[PDB]
Ligand SMILES: *Cc1cccc(C*)c1
Ligand SMILES: *Cc1cccc(C*)c1
Ligand SMILES: *Cc1cccc(C*)c1
Ligand SMILES: *Cc1cccc(C*)c1
Ligand SMILES: *Cc1cccc(C*)c1
Ligand SMILES: *Cc1cccc(C*)c1
Ligand SMILES: *Cc1cccc(C*)c1
Ligand SMILES: *Cc1cccc(C*)c1
Ligand SMILES: *Cc1cccc(C*)c1
């Protein structure tokens with residue numbers, strides 16, 4: 371993942387389970 | 392994933408399960 | 413992951429389970 | 434991971450379980 | 455991990471369990 | 476792979492060569 | 497692969513070569 | 518791999534060559 | 539790998555060559 | 560690897576060569 | 581990709597961006 | 602990738618960005 | 623990658639960025 | 644990577660950035 | 665990496681940055 | 686604009 | 693714009 | 700914009 | 707913008 | 714913007 | 721119900 | 728229900 | 735239900 | 742249900 | 749249910 | 756038979 | 763048969 | 770058959 | 777068959 | 784067949 375812009379303007383929950391990048 | 396612009400303007404939940412990128 | 417911009421403007425929870433990057 | 438910009442503007446919890454980077 | 459910029463602007467908890475970097 | 480149920484009821488040989496999961 | 501039920505009732509040989517799952 | 522149930526009921530040989538999980 | 543249940547009910551040989559988990 | 564249950568009910572040989580976990 | 585025979589007989593530039601093979 | 606034969610007979614530049622093989 | 627034969631017969635530049643093999 | 648044969652017959656530059664093999 | 669044969673027949677520069685093998 | 690998740 | 697998660 | 704997690 | 711975690 | 718963790 | 725493999 | 732492998 | 739491997 | 746390996 | 753390994 | 760790349 | 767790359 | 774790289 | 781790299 | 788690197 372490149373140049374990701376994560377700006378929800380609120381609450382943010384990121385649950386990532388065993389990524390292979 | 393490139394140049395992703397995640398701006399929901401509220402609550403954000405991202406659940407990603409075993410991605411292969 | 414490169415050039416990630418995580419600015420939720422609120423509460424942030426990141427749960428990452430066994431990533432392989 | 435390179436050039437990560439983690440600025441939630443609030444509370445931040447990062448739980449990373451056995452990463453291989 | 456290189457050039458990480460962790461500035462939550464609040465409370466910060468980092469729990470990292472057996473990383474291999 | 477999740478919830479795999481390998482019960483051949485005999486001899487079992489599994490040869491897996493460079494999986495990326 | 498999810499909820500796989502491998503019950504041949506005999507001899508079983510699985511040869512998987514460079515899967516990307 | 519999660520919740521794997523390997524019960525061949527006989528002889529079992531698992532040869533895994535350079536997995537990335 | 540999580541919650542693996544290896545019960546062949548016989549002889550078991552596991553040969554794993556340079557895993558990255 | 561977590562919660563592994565290795566109970567072959569017989570002879571067990573585990574040969575692991577340079578794992579990175 | 582298998583049995584690829586890349587013999588341009590000149591200059592060769594290969595730019596491959598995030599392949600999943 | 603298997604049995605690749607890269608013989609350009611000249612200059613060779615290979616730029617591969619985050620492959621998952 | 624297996625059995626790769628890289629013989630450009632000239633100058634060779636290989637730039638590989640975060641491969642997962 | 645196995646059985647790699649890197650014989651450019653000239654100048655060779657290999658730049659590999661955070662491989663996971 | 666196994667059985668690598670690096671014979672450029674010239675100048676060789678290998679720059680490897682944080683490999684995980 | 687809130688989010689509620691229940692399993 | 694809050695987030696609530698329950699399992 | 701708070702976050703609440705319950706398992 | 708607080709965070710609360712309960713297991 | 715506080716953090717509270719309970720197990 | 722046996723299996724025989726020859727290369 | 729046996730398995731025989733020969734290369 | 736035995737296993738025999740020969741290379 | 743035995744295992745025999747030969748290289 | 750024995751194991752025999754020969755190289 | 757040369758190659759020239761410009762961005 | 764040369765290669766030239768410019769960004 | 771040379772290689773030239775410029776960023 | 778030389779190599780030249782410039783950043 | 785020489786190598787020259789400049790940053
Ligand atoms: C885009 C992305 C999110 C989480 C983990 C990875 C490896 C990549
Ligand atoms: C686009 C994307 C989201 C999450 C994970 C990956 C690897 C990619
Ligand atoms: C994008 C990313 C998130 C968490 C862990 C990794 C290795 C990568
Ligand atoms: C992006 C990243 C987060 C946590 C751990 C690693 C190794 C990488
Ligand atoms: C990015 C990172 C976070 C924690 C530990 C490591 C080794 C790497
Ligand atoms: C389903 C499966 C079998 C063997 C290896 C992996 C990574 C996955
Ligand atoms: C279904 C399946 C079999 C073997 C390997 C994978 C990754 C998946
Ligand atoms: C499912 C599985 C089998 C062997 C190795 C891994 C990493 C995963
Ligand atoms: C599932 C598994 C088997 C052997 C080694 C690893 C790292 C994982």
Ligand SMILES: *Cc1cccc(C*)c1
Nearest residue numbers: 539560575578579580
């Ligand atoms: C699952 C596993 C088996 C052997 C070694 C490691 C590091 C992990």
Ligand SMILES: *Cc1cccc(C*)c1
Nearest residue numbers: 581596599600601622
């Ligand atoms: C055919 C091929 C070219 C480049 C990368 C991959 C994974 C495959």
Ligand SMILES: *Cc1cccc(C*)c1
Nearest residue numbers: 602617620621622643
């Ligand atoms: C075919 C190939 C080229 C570069 C990288 C990979 C993983 C595969």
Ligand SMILES: *Cc1cccc(C*)c1
Nearest residue numbers: 623638641642643664
């Ligand atoms: C084919 C290949 C080239 C570079 C790196 C990897 C892991 C594989």
Ligand SMILES: *Cc1cccc(C*)c1
Nearest residue numbers: 644659662663664685
């Ligand atoms: C094929 C290869 C090149 C460089 C590094 C690795 C781990 C693999």
Ligand SMILES: *Cc1cccc(C*)c1
Nearest residue numbers: 644665680683684685
């Ligand atoms: C193939 C390879 C090159 C450099 C470092 C490692 C760990 C592997």
